C-alpha cells in the first residue's frame, strides 16, 4: 500500500476514474472536462513550414549560430537578457507558441515547488523522507533526508540499461504510462518507488529520476494537492505565463514530475527570470532569496563523481534539482535528455532556453556541442 | 489490411510512433512537440468555485432556468442570438473557456468536413464507400453509398449492450483507446470497422457511431490528411475560434470522429453560427448553401423509425450527421450522450449550446427535460 493520495477530483475514490470508468457517474462530470488526462488526444488547430531565425544581436558575434542550432537538432531557442527577448529561433514546423517536452528540466521545476514549501515551513529538508511519506519505510528512501533526495545523494540499485525490460529505468516508464505495461509491473509510480532498494550509503551523487518523483509525492502529502495542481499553485500560476504547461500523468493522475512537463520556450524562460530575480515572479514570491542563493552556490563538489559532467565542469556539483557547472561564470542549468536546457547566466542577468530533439538521449558528442553553444551565447552577452 | 493512412508526421512509417517508440528517432522530433497525443496529460494552469449565471434577458421569461440547468447536470450553457451572446451559464468548477467533451455532437462536425469535400467535388455521396475505401470490401460497408453512411441508413449488426465486452459498442471503444484493450481486439479503429457485418439491407435509419468513423476514413483517403488535420483545415481553422479544439486519437493517431472532440461552449456556437449563415464562416466558406439547406430540410421521414426520437418529434428525421426535429420551428441539432446539444433555431437566428454530464448516457427522463429546456429557450427568443 502507498497510503493516501490526492483525489483526481473532489470526493473521488482512490484511483478513480480509470480508463474503464471515466464515463460513469460521478466521475464523468470531471472526466468530460479533462478527457486528455485519460485518453491520448490531439489539438485541432484554430489557426489556418519554415524556420524562424531572429538571432539579432548575438548573430554578429556568432555568424554560424543557426547552423550550430540545426546541427544540435534545435526545436526552440530563446535568449532572455534581463526582461527582454534578445534572440529567438524555431525550427520549421515548430511555432513560437508551441509547447515542447522538457524531460529532466522538469526536475528543476519540481525542486522549485519543494523550495516554496520549505519557505512556508511545511517541509524541513533535514527531516527523513519517511517523516512525510511513512509508506516508503523499508525502501531505499527509508533513512535518507529530504535534502539528500533534493541533492540526489542516495545510493540506489537503479539499472540504467533501458533495452532491458527488467531495468529500473524502463520499469519506471511503464509504471507511469510512458511505455506499454508488462504483466507484473507496479500499478502506478508510487508503487514503483516503494520497490527501490540500495545498500544504505548516502553522500555521493547518483542521478536517479525516481528521486524527483519522491519529491513530488512529499509535496502531495504535505499540501494535500495533486502534484499537477501544486506545480501550478506554487509555480506556474505565478509566472504570468502565456500558456498553461502540461504534464503527463500516470493511471492515478500523478504527474510524471521527473520529466513529463511540456511548455513554450518563452514561458520556460520565465522560470529562469524568477531565479535571477531572487525567487520573485510577477504573481508573487515563488521561493526565498536563500533558496535561490543556495542553488547558485552549488552542492558539495566531493559528492559529484559523474565524469560525464566533471570532464567539462571540473568544479561542478548538483543541488536542489539543478546542475551547477561551477565554472568561471557560475552557470547553473536545468538539463534534460535529447538536449533540453534552462540555462542561467547570472553575470549577464540572462536566461538561455534550448529545447531540442537529439536522436540520442545522451552522448559526449551532443553535450560537447550543446554546452559549446550555451557558453558561446553566454559570452556573447558580456559587455565589451 | 486497412490500406494507406496519413502518416503521424512527414515520412513516418505506418503506425509510428507507438507508446514504445516515441522517444526514438526520427519520431521524437514530432513526439516531443505533441506528447499529449501519446500519453495521457494534464494541464498545469497559468491562472491562480462558484457557478456563473448570466441568463440575462431570457431570465425574465424563464425564472427557474438556472435550477432547470442544474437539474439536467449542465456544465456549460450558451445562447447566441445572431452574432451576440445573450445568455450564459457555467457550473461551479467549470470556467467559461474550459473545454468539454462533445460526444456525438462530434458527428455533426465530421459531417461538415465531408460536406466541404463534396462542395470541392472530391467526394460524390452517390458513390459507394468502396470507391474511396476499397479495403471495406467484404464488410457491411461494401455496397452502401457515402450518402447512406451520412444519413445512417445501413443495417448493421451492432450490439448496443455495452456491459457485454463482446458487444460492438464496447469493442469500438477498446479499439480506439477509450477503454482498456482486451486480447484479440482490433488493433485500431480502421481494423474494427472492417469487422462489421449486416444483412445488406439499407434505407432505414440505424444510429451507429461506426458510420461516422467510416466518414472520417473517407475524408483521409480523399485528402491525404490525418482526420485531426482535416477537421482543422476544413472547419475549425475557419471559425476564428478562441481556442483549439481537441480530439482523442487511437494508437495510429486516428481521431475518434464519432465522439471524441472537446471544445469551449462559445467556440461550438461558432459552428452553429456558420450553419445559420448559409455555410460561411469568418475564415471563409465551410460548406455550400445547398449543403446547409439540405441539412435544415431533413432526411426521409419514413427512414426514421427510432421511437426514442419520434415520440417527441413525430415528423423528425436524420441527415448528414444532424438530427432534424421536423417541429414547427424547424429545429435541427447535433446531439451527444449525457446531454450534449448544438441546437439550431433558425426562426430566431439563434444557436443554443448545452454541454452536460447526466449520470446516464440516455434515458427518456433526461431527454424530456433537456428538450423541454431547449424548446423553452428557443421560444423565449421569439419576437413578442
Ligand atoms: N524515464 C523518463 C525520462 C526522464 C528524463 C530524464 C532526463 O531528462 O535526464
Ligand atoms: N462509444 C463512444 C461514445 C460516442 C458518443 C455516442 C453519442 O454521443 O451518441
Question: What b/e sequence results for B259-291 when a residue is b if at least 16 CB atoms lie within 10 Å of its CB, and e otherwise?
Answer: bbbbbbbbbbbbbbbbbbbebbbebeebbbeeb
Evaluate whether A161 touches A150 at the Cβ level (below 8 Å).
no
The answer to whether position A193 is within a domain reads yes
Whether A211 and A300 share a structural domain: no
Among B42, B47, B233, the residue with its CB nearest the CB of A246 is: B42
Residue pointed to by grid coordinates 472532440: B261
Going from the Cα of B203 to the center of ligand 1, the distance in angstroms, rounded, reads 56
Going from the Cα of B124 to the center of ligand 1, the distance in angstroms, rounded, reads 50
Pairwise CB contact (< 8 Å): B46 & A241: yes
Residue A361, C-alpha cell as written in the block: 538521449
Find the closest chain B residue to A242 by CA distance. Answer: B46
Q: Round to whole Å and give the CA distance between B123 and B17.
A: 30
Selection from A243, A242, A269 nearest residue A77 by Cα: A269
Residue B377, C-alpha cell as written in the block: 429557450
Q: Round to whole Å and give the CA distance between B332 and B297.
A: 9
Q: Which ligand is nearest to the CA of A323?
A: 1
A373: three-class secondary structure by DSSP = helix
Going from the Cα of B94 to the center of ligand 1, the distance in angstroms, rounded, reads 33
The answer to whether position B302 is within a domain reads yes
The answer to whether position B34 is within a domain reads no
Residue B124, C-alpha cell as written in the block: 460524390
Per DSSP, B81 falls in state E
Cα torsion for B368, B369, B370, B372, to the nearest 10°? 80
Q: Round to whole Å and give the CA distance between A188 and A171.
A: 11
Residue pointed to by grid coordinates 565524469: A307
Residue A305, C-alpha cell as written in the block: 563523481
Q: Which atom of ligand 1 is nearest to the CA of A337?
A: 8
Evaluate whether B79 touches B58 at the Cβ level (below 8 Å).
yes
Q: Which of residues 35-74 of B touch A (CB under 8 A)?
A: 35-48, 73
CATH of the domain at A106: 3.40.710.10
Backbone breaks in chain B (C–N > 2.5 Å) follow which residues?
A: 48
Q: Whose CA is nearest to atom 4 of ligand 2?
A: B259
Pairwise CB contact (< 8 Å): B40 & A44: no
Evaluate whether A246 touches A262 at the Cβ level (below 8 Å).
yes
Whether B176 and B285 share a structural domain: no
Whether A287 and A378 share a structural domain: yes
Q: Round to whole Å and give the CA distance between B344 and B378.
A: 9
Q: Round to whole Å and give the CA distance between A81 and A77.
A: 13
The answer to whether position B91 is within a domain reads yes
CATH of the domain at A212: 1.20.58.710
Q: Round to whole Å and give the CA distance between A254 and A247.
A: 9
The answer to whether position A255 is within a domain reads yes
Evaluate whether A335 touches A341 at the Cβ level (below 8 Å).
yes
**β-strands B261-263, B100-101: how paired?**
antiparallel
Q: Bridge-partner residues for B90, per DSSP? A: B52, B76
Whether A229 and A212 share a structural domain: no
Which of B176, B203, B224 is the C-terminal boundary of a domain? B224
What CA–CA distances, in Å, run from B334 to B65, B192, B345? 22, 25, 12
Nearest-Cα distance to chain A for B124, in Å, is 26
The answer to whether position A158 is within a domain reads yes
Selection from A340, A353, A374, A345 nearest residue A82 by Cα: A345
What CA–CA distances, in Å, run from A152 to A141, A324, B77, B294? 11, 13, 50, 66
Which of B182, B202, B224 is the C-terminal boundary of a domain? B224
Residue B286, C-alpha cell as written in the block: 465551410
Q: What residues line ligand 2, using a CB cutoff of 6 Å? A: B 103-104, 169, 172-173, 178, 209, 258-259, 336-337
Evaluate whether B247 touches A44 at the Cβ level (below 8 Å).
yes
Q: Which helix (H) or strand (E) holds A266?
A: helix A265-276
**CB burial class (10 A; 0-12, 13-18, 19+) of residue B206?**
middle
**Measured from the CB, is residue A337 less than 6 Å from ligand 1?**
yes
Selection from B81, B75, B49 nearest residue B263 by Cα: B75
Whether A218 and A244 share a structural domain: no
Q: Round to whole Å and give the CA distance between B127 and B216.
A: 16
What CA–CA distances, in Å, run from A68 to A50, A371, B7, B27? 17, 11, 29, 22
Whether A108 and A134 share a structural domain: no
Selection from A251, A228, A241 nearest residue A177 by Cα: A251
Which of B191, B224, B257 is the C-terminal boundary of a domain? B224
Whether A384 and A255 share a structural domain: yes
First to last CA, chain B: 60
**β-strands B74-81, B100-101: how paired?**
unpaired
Contacts of A78 (CB under 8 A, 6+ apart): A85, A87, A88, A89, A265, A266, A269, A352, A353
Question: What b/e sequence results for A77-107 when a residue is b if at least 16 CB atoms lie within 10 Å of its CB, and e otherwise?
Answer: bbbbbeeebbbbbbbeebeeebbbbbbbbbb
The answer to whether position B108 is within a domain reads yes
Among A44, A233, A244, the residue with its CB nearest the CB of B231 is: A44
Alpha helices in B65-195 (DSSP H): 65-71, 105-119, 146-150, 168-176, 189-194
Whether B117 and B190 share a structural domain: no
The answer to whether position A12 is within a domain reads no
Q: What share of chain B is helix, strand, coil (3-state, %, to 5)?
A: 35, 15, 50
Q: Which residues constitute the domain of residue B155?
A: 125-224
What CA–CA distances, in Å, run from B126 to B106, B118, B129, B295, B356? 23, 11, 9, 17, 36
Contacts of B274 (CB under 8 A, 6+ apart): B238, B239, B280, B281, B286, B287
Mutate to test the pocket of ligand 2, among B172, B179, B258 (most ligand atoms within 8 A of CB): B258
Residue A323, φ and ψ in degrees, nearest 5: -90, 130
Nearest-Cα distance to chain B for A220, in Å, is 15
Q: Bridge-partner residues for B294, per DSSP? A: none
**Measured from the CB, is residue A347 less than 6 Å from ligand 1?**
no
Q: Whose CA is nearest to atom 6 of ligand 2?
A: B104
Nearest-Cα distance to chain A for B146, in Å, is 25
Whether A147 and A290 share a structural domain: no
Pairwise CB contact (< 8 Å): A40 & B177: yes
Find the closest chain B residue to A231 by CA distance. Answer: B44
Nearest-Cα distance to chain B for A129, in Å, is 26
Q: Round to whole Å and give the CA distance between A240 and A13.
A: 34
Q: What is the total count of domains within chain A? A: 2
**β-strands B74-81, B350-356: how paired?**
antiparallel
Selection from A295, A38, A360, A17 nearest residue A150 by Cα: A295
Contacts of B26 (CB under 8 A, 6+ apart): A359, B11, B12
**Measured from the CB, is residue A336 less than 6 Å from ligand 1?**
yes
Among B35, B262, B361, the residue with its CB nearest the CB of A248 is: B35
Evaluate whether A160 touches A167 at the Cβ level (below 8 Å).
yes
Which residues on B lie below 8 Å from A260 (Cβ)? 35, 39, 41
Q: Which of residues 9-28 of A touch B (CB under 8 A)?
A: 18-20, 23, 25-26, 28
What CA–CA distances, in Å, run from A25 to A11, A21, A45? 12, 8, 31
Q: Round to whole Å and give the CA distance between B178 and B256.
A: 9
Selection from B173, B340, B245 nearest residue A19 by Cα: B173
Long-range contacts of B287-290 (CB under 8 A, 24+ apart): B287/B112, B287/B115, B287/B116, B287/B119, B288/B115, B288/B118, B288/B119
Resolution (angstroms) equals 1.7
Residue pointed to by grid coordinates 443554443: B352
Going from the Cα of B17 to the center of ligand 2, the distance in angstroms, rounded, reads 27
Number of Cβ within a 10 Å radius of residue A184: 6
No. of helices (H) and no. of strands (E), chain A: 13, 14
Evaluate whether A281 touches A239 at the Cβ level (below 8 Å).
yes
Q: Which atom of ligand 2 is nearest to the CA of B340?
A: 8
Whether A131 and A238 share a structural domain: no
Whether B144 and B259 share a structural domain: no
Which residues on A lie below 8 Å from B33 (Cβ)? 75, 94, 98-101
Q: Which helix (H) or strand (E) holds B295?
A: helix B289-297
Contacts of B3 (CB under 8 A, 6+ apart): B133, B134, B135, B221
Evaluate whether A245 touches B36 at the Cβ level (below 8 Å).
no
Pairwise CB contact (< 8 Å): A228 & B42: yes
Whether B217 and B236 share a structural domain: no
- Bond into B99 cis (ω within 30): no
Amino acid at each position: 500500500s502507498t497510503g493516501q493520495h490526492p483525489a483526481r477530483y473532489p470526493g473521488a475514490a482512490a484511483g478513480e476514474p480509470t480508463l474503464d470508468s471515466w464515463q460513469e457517474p460521478p466521475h464523468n462530470r470531471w472526466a468530460f472536462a479533462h478527457l486528455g488526462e485519460m485518453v491520448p488526444s490531439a489539438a485541432v488547430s484554430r489557426r489556418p513550414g519554415h524556420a524562424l531565425a531572429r538571432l539579432g544581436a548575438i548573430a554578429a558575434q556568432l555568424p554560424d549560430l543557426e547552423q550550430r542550432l540545426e546541427q544540435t537538432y534545435t526545436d526552440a531557442f530563446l535568449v532572455l537578457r534581463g526582461t527582454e527577448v534578445v534572440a529567438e529561433y524555431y525550427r520549421a514546423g515548430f511555432a513560437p507558441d508551441d509547447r515542447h517536452l522538457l524531460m529532466a528540466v522538469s526536475k528543476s521545476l519540481c525542486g522549485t515547488v519543494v523550495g516554496a514549501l520549505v519557505d512556508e515551513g511545511r517541509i524541513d529538508p533535514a527531516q527523513p523522507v519517511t517523516e512525510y511519506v511513512p509508506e516508503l519505510a523499508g525502501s531505499v528512501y527509508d533513512g535518507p533526508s529530504v535534502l539528500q533526495v533534493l541533492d540526489m545523494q542516495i545510493s540506489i540499485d537503479y539499472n540504467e540499461d533501458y533495452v532491458d525490460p527488467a531495468s529500473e529505468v524502463q520499469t519506471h516508464d511503464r509504471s507511469a504510462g510512458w511505455a506499454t505495461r508488462r504483466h507484473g509491473d507496479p500499478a502506478d509510480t508510487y508503487e514503483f518507488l516503494t520497490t527501490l532498494r540500495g545498500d544504505g550509503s548516502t553522500g555521493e551523487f547518483q542521478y536517479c529520476s525516481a528521486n524527483t518523483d519522491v519529491l513530488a509525492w512529499i509535496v502531495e502529502r504535505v499540501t494535500g494537492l495533486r502534484y499537477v495542481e501544486a506545480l501550478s499553485t506554487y509555480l506556474w500560476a505565478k509566472l504570468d505565463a502565456d500558456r498553461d504547461a502540461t504534464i503527463t500523468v500516470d493511471t492515478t493522475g500523478f504527474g510524471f514530475a521527473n520529466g513529463g512537463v511540456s511548455c513554450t520556450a518563452r514561458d520556460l524562460a520565465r522560470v529562469g527570470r524568477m531565479m535571477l530575480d531572487g525567487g520573485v515572479a510577477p504573481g508573487g514570491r515563488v521561493v526565498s532569496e536563500d533558496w535561490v542563493r543556495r542553488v547558485l552556490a552549488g552542492g558539495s563538489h566531493e559528492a559529484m563523481t559523474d565524469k560525464g559532467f566533471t570532464n567539462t565542469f571540473p568544479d561542478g556539483s548538483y543541488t536542489r534539482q539543478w546542475w551547477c557547472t561551477g565554472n568561471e561564470r557560475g552557470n547553473v542549468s536545468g538539463i534534460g535528455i535529447h538536449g533540453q536546457n534552462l540555462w542561467l547566466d547570472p553575470l549577464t542577468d540572462s536566461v538561455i532556453v534550448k529545447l531540442s530533439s537529439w536522436p540520442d538521449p545522451y552522448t559526449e558528442h551532443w553535450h560537447r556541442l550543446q554546452n559549446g553553444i550555451l557558453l558561446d551565447v553566454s559570452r556573447a552577452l558580456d559587455a565589451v
